[PDB]
Design a protein around this motif. Structure first.
Motif, PDB file in Angstrom:
ATOM      1  N   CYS A  17     -18.411   7.291   0.044  1.00  0.00           N
ATOM      2  CA  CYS A  17     -17.107   6.769  -0.377  1.00  0.00           C
ATOM      3  C   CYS A  17     -17.079   6.581  -1.882  1.00  0.00           C
ATOM      4  O   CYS A  17     -16.072   6.871  -2.498  1.00  0.00           O
ATOM      5  CB  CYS A  17     -16.782   5.447   0.314  1.00  0.00           C
ATOM      6  N   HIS A  77     -10.194   9.011   2.518  1.00  0.00           N
ATOM      7  CA  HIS A  77      -9.365   8.094   1.762  1.00  0.00           C
ATOM      8  C   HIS A  77      -8.154   7.743   2.647  1.00  0.00           C
ATOM      9  O   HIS A  77      -7.370   8.630   2.966  1.00  0.00           O
ATOM     10  CB  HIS A  77      -8.940   8.792   0.478  1.00  0.00           C
ATOM     11  N   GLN A  83      -5.758  -3.455  -7.884  1.00  0.00           N
ATOM     12  CA  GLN A  83      -5.666  -2.175  -7.145  1.00  0.00           C
ATOM     13  C   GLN A  83      -6.917  -1.995  -6.304  1.00  0.00           C
ATOM     14  O   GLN A  83      -8.027  -2.353  -6.752  1.00  0.00           O
ATOM     15  CB  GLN A  83      -5.618  -0.981  -8.118  1.00  0.00           C
ATOM     16  N   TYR A 112      -5.690   4.817   2.388  1.00  0.00           N
ATOM     17  CA  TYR A 112      -4.510   4.406   1.638  1.00  0.00           C
ATOM     18  C   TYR A 112      -4.951   3.727   0.339  1.00  0.00           C
ATOM     19  O   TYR A 112      -6.133   3.352   0.200  1.00  0.00           O
ATOM     20  CB  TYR A 112      -3.585   3.509   2.514  1.00  0.00           C
ATOM     21  N   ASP A 113      -4.037   3.574  -0.601  1.00  0.00           N
ATOM     22  CA  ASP A 113      -4.270   2.797  -1.810  1.00  0.00           C
ATOM     23  C   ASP A 113      -3.446   1.511  -1.710  1.00  0.00           C
ATOM     24  O   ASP A 113      -2.369   1.509  -1.107  1.00  0.00           O
ATOM     25  CB  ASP A 113      -3.780   3.578  -3.007  1.00  0.00           C
ATOM     26  N   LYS A 138      -9.973   8.672  -8.076  1.00  0.00           N
ATOM     27  CA  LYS A 138      -9.374   7.717  -9.029  1.00  0.00           C
ATOM     28  C   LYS A 138      -9.367   8.266 -10.490  1.00  0.00           C
ATOM     29  O   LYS A 138      -8.816   7.635 -11.394  1.00  0.00           O
ATOM     30  CB  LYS A 138     -10.166   6.404  -8.937  1.00  0.00           C
ATOM     31  N   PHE A 155     -14.503   8.377  -4.299  1.00  0.00           N
ATOM     32  CA  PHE A 155     -13.582   7.424  -4.970  1.00  0.00           C
ATOM     33  C   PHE A 155     -13.488   7.659  -6.483  1.00  0.00           C
ATOM     34  O   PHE A 155     -12.388   7.702  -7.030  1.00  0.00           O
ATOM     35  CB  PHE A 155     -14.006   5.966  -4.710  1.00  0.00           C
ATOM     36  N   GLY A 206       0.808  -1.208   0.000  1.00  0.00           N
ATOM     37  CA  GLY A 206       0.000   0.000   0.000  1.00  0.00           C
ATOM     38  C   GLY A 206       0.837   1.251   0.000  1.00  0.00           C
ATOM     39  O   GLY A 206       2.074   1.178   0.105  1.00  0.00           O
ATOM     40  N   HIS A 226      -1.672   8.033   2.477  1.00  0.00           N
ATOM     41  CA  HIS A 226      -1.905   9.464   2.466  1.00  0.00           C
ATOM     42  C   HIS A 226      -2.124   9.971   3.901  1.00  0.00           C
ATOM     43  O   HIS A 226      -3.225   9.816   4.437  1.00  0.00           O
ATOM     44  CB  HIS A 226      -3.135   9.672   1.598  1.00  0.00           C
ATOM     45  N   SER A 277      -8.705   0.777  -2.880  1.00  0.00           N
ATOM     46  CA  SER A 277      -8.458   1.921  -2.006  1.00  0.00           C
ATOM     47  C   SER A 277      -9.172   1.610  -0.698  1.00  0.00           C
ATOM     48  O   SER A 277     -10.244   0.991  -0.689  1.00  0.00           O
ATOM     49  CB  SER A 277      -9.023   3.233  -2.585  1.00  0.00           C
ATOM     50  N   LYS A 278      -8.587   2.001   0.409  1.00  0.00           N
ATOM     51  CA  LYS A 278      -9.259   1.798   1.699  1.00  0.00           C
ATOM     52  C   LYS A 278      -9.886   3.113   2.086  1.00  0.00           C
ATOM     53  O   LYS A 278      -9.203   4.143   2.077  1.00  0.00           O
ATOM     54  CB  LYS A 278      -8.242   1.357   2.765  1.00  0.00           C
ATOM     55  N   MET A 279     -11.173   3.093   2.422  1.00  0.00           N
ATOM     56  CA  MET A 279     -11.880   4.354   2.744  1.00  0.00           C
ATOM     57  C   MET A 279     -12.833   4.155   3.919  1.00  0.00           C
ATOM     58  O   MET A 279     -13.172   3.022   4.240  1.00  0.00           O
ATOM     59  CB  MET A 279     -12.662   4.882   1.544  1.00  0.00           C
TER      60      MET A 279
END
Lengths: 274, 275
Positions: free
Chosen positions: B79, B266, B2, B268-269, B87, B83, A270, A273, B4-6
């Motif tokens: 989200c 957001h 891929q 992390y990715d 993105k 997102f 990961g 941010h 994203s964690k949100m």
């Protein structure tokens, strides 16, 4: 900040390359990152650093979820070794590292397991610490009405190891708490419940000091095998089956270090941010 | 893959773009991924898809940590809208989307919050479901020796909303599980403890159906303001302070949809190899 998420038998880590990246932490930041909903979500943070020494490949530090530094963690050691190889920070089979517990060489095997030199088991009661007359292969302990036969050993942390017929029926939930804070353990103990399947194969449950039953306690696995070896029950290489999975322990007895071979799983990569 | 964690102040999401990559799941894979130790760790999985109607910008679907699809109005909406923008799937601020609950327009405001049309609150006890004689503004309920006064409403899901003097001294820990599985709620209920600070401002704690207290329950925030509006306690625009932070609710009353505005963060990715 790039990171990897890893686990050694379910004990999970955020792992960070601070060799090729500038990486800055504070205790509050670590606490926020450890949070499973608001952050990355981990039990421990492992930060990989340059060695500053030509006889070392890396330094690493481990922080707990409260943001404070931790001394010894061999789930940590295995995640570290696979991390530096997966990330291309090294290509060495035998990796020289310094940690808060001193210097170590870690070996990454052909099947992608990591072998850790866990040092020589110390059976001396004062080193555990354990209240006893002197070192004995088997002690009798009282746990209220129950008579317990155990072995006691230090792997750098204290262990009390009890042989049971079947780990699944072992009175872990009741006997664990009684023994973990027994009067004979001034600094408490990890309590192992060891079922000998064959001389080469045990099943194990561990009631950890200050934590209760955990999925995998590698130091408990080392301790159970050291005790079982000393008691004449086990061969020199032993498969250990914990709830979280398998470790392999190797020990040639007094005068030798004990080795622990185990997996380290890379879950995802990961970027956070900040 | 891929991802994203949100999160939206409460439950967290793994969010995945199924527009620019092929995304393949099985119920068991979702369960492994949701695992906090062995996987990514999330309450729900949000999958963002191309639209299947030229009239829409996207479709999205949501699965729970058991791997089954969730169809709850507005769930994951904030989200989702943040997102698709972060993105670079769209630059629109008014985003038309289909979901398991029908079509919606989501609006991303100038301060990057998202406004969601949550439908019209339904106070009919049969729709909750709630055992009662008929719809009333206030019901008397039995909780141990204590008489509870509450309002009851459906936001697609069941809510019971109790007014308290102070959310901090509210018996959430004891009253909450008692009301949550009360026999008068055939499908259980989210239990709101609402402190009216003024007509335009409440503090709220929510004991959620089958989960206990969370940091923020969006639908609970909606329900609390709907009930407070009906009971004559609240203005048409209400700031709601939950332990996790702030939502804003606007509702003109019966005949109108209720709107919830709130943030999505957001965290992390990531990238995960799936064999």
């Amino acid at each position: 900040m790039q990171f990897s998420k890893m686990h050694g038998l379910g004990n999970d880590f955020m792992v960070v390359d601070a060799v090729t990246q500038n990486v800055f932490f504070s205790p509050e930041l670590i606490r926020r990152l450890a949070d499973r909903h608001l952050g990355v979500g981990f039990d421990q943070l492992l930060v990989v650093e340059p060695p500053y020494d030509p006889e070392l490949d890396f330094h690493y530090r481990i922080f707990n979820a409260d943001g404070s530094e931790v001394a010894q963690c061999g789930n940590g050691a295995r995640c570290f070794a696979r991390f530096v190889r997966l990330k291309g920070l090294t290509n060495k089979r035998d990796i020289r590292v310094s940690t808060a517990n001193g210097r170590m060489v870690l070996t990454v095997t052909d099947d992608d397991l990591v072998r850790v030199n866990m040092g020589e088991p110390n059976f001396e009661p004062s080193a555990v610490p354990f209240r006893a007359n002197k070192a004995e292969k088997t002690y009798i302990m009282r746990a209220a009405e129950q008579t317990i036969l155990c072995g006691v050993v230090s792997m750098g942390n204290p262990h009390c190891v009890i042989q049971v017929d079947d780990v699944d029926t072992a009175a872990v939930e009741t006997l664990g708490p009684v023994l973990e804070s027994h009067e004979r353990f001034p600094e408490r103990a990890n309590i192992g419940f060891m079922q000998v399947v064959k001389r080469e194969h045990i099943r194990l449950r561990v009631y950890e000091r200050g934590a209760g039953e955990t999925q995998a306690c590698g130091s408990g696995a080392c301790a159970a095998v050291a005790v079982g070896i000393q008691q004449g029950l086990l061969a020199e290489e032993v498969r250990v089956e914990l709830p979280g999975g398998r470790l392999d322990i190797a020990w040639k007895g007094p005068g030798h270090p004990l080795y622990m071979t185990g997996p380290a799983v890379h879950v995802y990569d990961g970027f956070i941010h900040l």
